[PDB]
Amino acid sequence: LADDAPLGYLLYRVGAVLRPEVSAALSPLGLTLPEFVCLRMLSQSPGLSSAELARHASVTPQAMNTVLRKLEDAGAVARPASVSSGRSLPATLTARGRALAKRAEAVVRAADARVLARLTAPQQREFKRMLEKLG
Amino acid sequence: MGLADDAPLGYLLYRVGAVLRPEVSAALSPLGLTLPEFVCLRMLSQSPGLSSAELARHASVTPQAMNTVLRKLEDAGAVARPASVSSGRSLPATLTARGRALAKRAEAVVRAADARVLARLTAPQQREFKRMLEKLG
């Protein structure tokens, strides 16, 4: 049928507008979108599985694991001691990574503002309320 | 408070998608379709011969999985790649009559599933919301 736009398709197109602008906004900080996903979500949920991080970042779990290894090698994500056990604590942000995540969150906030700029301010607030009500 | 604190737009969009996908899949199940197969059907119904990569991106799946979906729909008589009648090439993937009828039923149930996800906004909020989605995309 020629006149079919399902909700999932509309969401995907908003995403297709959004992801390149978020990437371009993150580029001056040396970050990709999956790295920002990893940083912020790890700042909210320590040790969150690579599978869910990959699901959120629209990447394969292998690619998200490479993201994790790079952020760990760069000193942004640490798995600390856990002096009681033989295994480490859930993956967590360092001071390096938390300052990094704060700047990335500023830049991503601005990028979302530029994507939302095709609506009026009340339309933007109402649209965000609808998104929160749907999710 | 919680995970939604200072939630970026991509995270909120992902949350709506996370509500929507199980309901769409459950709605598609009685027709023998998965979500990736339906995405493939609809997109092929409007754009013949679309690369497996783009179909996979739209279905949020790997290109390998989308190639399996393609074999699946072709084996089921919904998607044909017929031989070129006088060259030797293979024609772009398009829907057959059976694939078009299949897509008509699938789009009916998917529309209903979207209605159930949208039921958490009022009807005017539904119209507003979909127009806003259209302007954002």
Ligand SMILES: O=C(O)c1ccccc1O
């Ligand atoms: O039609 C789509 O492209 C789609 C995508 C994701 C979820 C549900 C959908 O109908």
Ligand SMILES: O=C(O)c1ccccc1O
């Ligand atoms: O923060 C996210 O989870 C996100 C996901 C996709 C695109 C942009 C984003 O900020």
